[PDB]
Amino acid sequence: IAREDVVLNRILGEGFFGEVYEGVYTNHKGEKINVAVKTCKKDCTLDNKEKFMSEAVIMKNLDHPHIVKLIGIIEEEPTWIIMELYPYGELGHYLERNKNSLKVLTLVLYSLQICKAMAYLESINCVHRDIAVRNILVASPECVKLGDFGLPIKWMSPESINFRRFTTASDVWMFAVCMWEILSFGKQPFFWLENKDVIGVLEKGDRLPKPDLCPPVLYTLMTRCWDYDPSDRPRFTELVCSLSDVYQMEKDIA
Numbered sequence: 001i002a003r004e005d006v007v008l009n010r011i012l013g014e015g016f017f018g019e020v021y022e023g024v025y026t027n028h029k030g031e032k033i034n035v036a037v038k039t040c041k042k043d044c045t046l047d048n049k050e051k052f053m054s055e056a057v058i059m060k061n062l063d064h065p066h067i068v069k070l071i072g073i074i075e076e077e078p079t080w081i082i083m084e085l086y087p088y089g090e091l092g093h094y095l096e097r098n099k100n101s102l103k104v105l106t107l108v109l110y111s112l113q114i115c116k117a118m119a120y121l122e123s124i125n126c127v128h129r130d131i132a133v134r135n136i137l138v139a140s141p142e143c144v145k146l147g148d149f150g151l152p153i154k155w156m157s158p159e160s161i162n163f164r165r166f167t168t169a170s171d172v173w174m175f176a177v178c179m180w181e182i183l184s185f186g187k188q189p190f191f192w193l194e195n196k197d198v199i200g201v202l203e204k205g206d207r208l209p210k211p212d213l214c215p216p217v218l219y220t221l222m223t224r225c226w227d228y229d230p231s232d233r234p235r236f237t238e239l240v241c242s243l244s245d246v247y248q249m250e251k252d253i254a
């Protein structure tokens with residue numbers, strides 16, 4: 001990818017190594033693709049440059065339908081990592097704007113798609129550590145994609161809060177919090193608490209209540225993901241099966 005093919009529009013945020021810009025990449029076909037362009041401060045250490053670069057090296061290998069996509073890297077200074085964006089933005093904000101028209105089936109679909117992404121990550125023993133609607137892009141009305149754009153106490157498992165332990169089992173907890181967000185049309189988990197109060201509530205056995213539109217069977221699955229004991233939470237691999245069941249049940253009802 002040639003730098004002249006990428007036009008930057010505005011700053012999206014301050015990344016860990018430098019600003020992230022929104023841009024338009026015009027490919028060889030002349031079609032315009034929305035992109036996020038990550039940059040790296042010039043005066044960084046060699047180790048930090050290597051870390052910056054590693055995202056490109058890693059993400060080149062990801063081609064899952066529900067994981068975000070690397071468009072390319074321009075290695076020449078200033079080094080840019082170019083990621084694919086879509087018209088619709090973050091899922092959180094998409095749910096907020098479309099709450100009056102989204103059907104429960106679609107909310108279960110998004111949940112299932114993110115679960116499939118996580119079953120892939122689980123297969124290579126990779127941990128996300130930050131599963132939430134803010135980390136999900138809407139590629140189309142029928143397709144969401146999991147990313148990592150950026151402690152999230154209100155999403156975290158008790159072992160992550162208490163010991164900073166993060167495993168696939170702690171990801172399953174967070175994923176069920178993410179499901180709760182989706183079925184709540186983007187509401188923030190424990191918005192009625194301060195971060196400091198969260199562990200006390202979880203320790204005493206309290207949990208996020210069932211979202212109004214959430215099917216009871218799906219809520220039961222969420223609660224299993226929120227078992228205090230990490231060993232009692234389902235694997236993502238099996239949760240795909242359970243969520244597929246809920247989807248088919250909801251499709252039939254429809």
Ligand SMILES: Cc1ccc(-n2nc(C(C)(C)C)cc2NC(=O)Nc2ccc(OCCN3CCOCC3)c3ccccc23)cc1
Pocket residue numbers: 012013020036051054055058059062067068069083084085089090128137146147148149150
């Ligand atoms: C070293 C390293 C290695 C791997 C990763 N990594 N790993 C994952 C998995 C776990 C899902 C596979 C995802 C990522 N990285 C990312 O997802 N990086 C990205 C960061 C910021 C972005 O845009 C920010 C701007 N934001 C986008 C959403 O809309 C509002 C603005 C992105 C926008 C589109 C696509 C990717 C983006 C990360 C770092």
